[PDB]
């Protein structure tokens, strides 16, 4: 009775996103279902909790010792954007949320470019902004300013891409889902989404999807 997909996750800008896609897929195709394994991302739990991202058994699934990761009938996939691509290729047969590499090589490339932009830019830089507010023991203005300025620059790139559209590649798909995990916590990072009104409306359009709520809530 095991589900075909197991999602190892935590309620975070990265952990929400495969669950969002899984719920979107279910709403369209009727499946697949998934099992959720809630993992500790607290360094104070290292060694002493089985479901903890540094525990060795989990490194066989995600060698980086971070969430999210999935297994699909035993096959492991780590890194948010790679998980989204995997799930789309295996379950999104009508291309509702993703572009086909064979029939749409240029559109597929576009999708990869925006995923990699988020994966190398928004996620890392907004995460460093969060680091220097929440976790660094001292206030370090050089670093706080560096990462807030860089996050603002990246959100301007995103806002400009959203001008004249409702979604990054026109129709809602996995590039929106990846970025949305971070964009919905942008205010708490110190960005003003009212300064990026295309981004703000896009976050609101996605937040109101029932599958998005179900995916976020599955991580709690």
Ligand X SMILES: N[C@@H](CCC(=O)N[C@@H](CSSC[C@H](NC(=O)CC[C@H](N)C(=O)O)C(=O)NCC(=O)O)C(=O)NCC(=O)O)C(=O)O
- The contact set with a second copy (CB under 8 A) reads 63-65, 75, 77-82, 85-86, 89-90, 101-102, 105-106, 109, 112-113, 115-117, 119-121, 123-125, 128, 131, 136-138, 140, 142-143, 146, 154, 157, 160-161
Binding-residue pattern over the window 43 to 82 for ligand X, x denoting contact by CB under 6 A:
----------x-----------xxxx----------xx--
Q: Which of 172, 208, 158, 177 is nearest to 17 (CA)?
A: 177
Looking at the Cβ atoms of 12 and 71, the one nearer to ligand X is: 12
Residue pair 77/84 in contact by the 8 Å Cβ criterion = no
Report the distance separating Cα 126 and Cα 190, nearest Å.
10
Q: Which does 75 bind (CB under 5 to 8 A by kind): a second copy, ligand X, none?
A: a second copy
Q: Residue written as tokens 């001008």? A: 163
Size of site (CB under 6 A) for ligand X: 20
Nearer to a second copy, 89 or 217 (CB): 89
How far is Cα 84 from Cα 77, in angstroms, rounded to an integer?
10
Question: 28: Cβ–Cβ under 8 A, 6 or more apart, which residues?
Answer: 92, 94, 96, 97
SS3 70: strand
For ligand X, the binding residues (CB under 6 A) are: 10, 12-15, 41, 53, 65-68, 79-80, 119-121, 123-124, 127, 131
């Amino acid at each position: 009775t095991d589900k075909p997909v197991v999602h190892y996750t935590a309620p975070t800008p990265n952990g929400w996103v495969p669950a969002i896609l899984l719920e979107e897929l279910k709403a369209v195709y009727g499946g697949p279902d998934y099992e959720t394994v809630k993992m500790s991302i607290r360094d104070a739990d290292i060694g002493k909790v089985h479901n903890q991202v540094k525990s060795d058994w989990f490194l066989k699934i995600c060698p980086n010792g971070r969430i999210p990761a999935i297994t699909h009938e035993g096959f492991p996939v780590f890194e948010t954007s790679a998980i989204l691509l995997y799930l789309a290729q295996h379950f999104d047969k009508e291309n509702a949320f993703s572009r086909d590499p064979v029939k749409d090589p240029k559109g597929y490339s576009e999708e990869l470019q925006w995923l990699f932009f988020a994966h190398g830019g928004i996620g890392p830089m907004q995460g460093q902004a969060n680091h220097f507010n929440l976790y660094a023991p001292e206030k370090i203005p050089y670093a706080i300013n560096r990462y807030l300025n860089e996050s603002k620059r990246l959100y301007r790139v995103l806002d400009d891409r959203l001008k004249g559209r409702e979604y990054i590649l026109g129709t809602y798909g996995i590039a929106d889902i990846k970025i949305f995990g971070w964009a919905r916590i942008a205010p708490r990072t110190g960005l003003d989404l009212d300064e990026f009104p295309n981004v703000k409306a896009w976050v609101e359009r996605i937040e109101k999807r029932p599958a998005v709520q179900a995916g976020i809530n599955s991580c709690n």
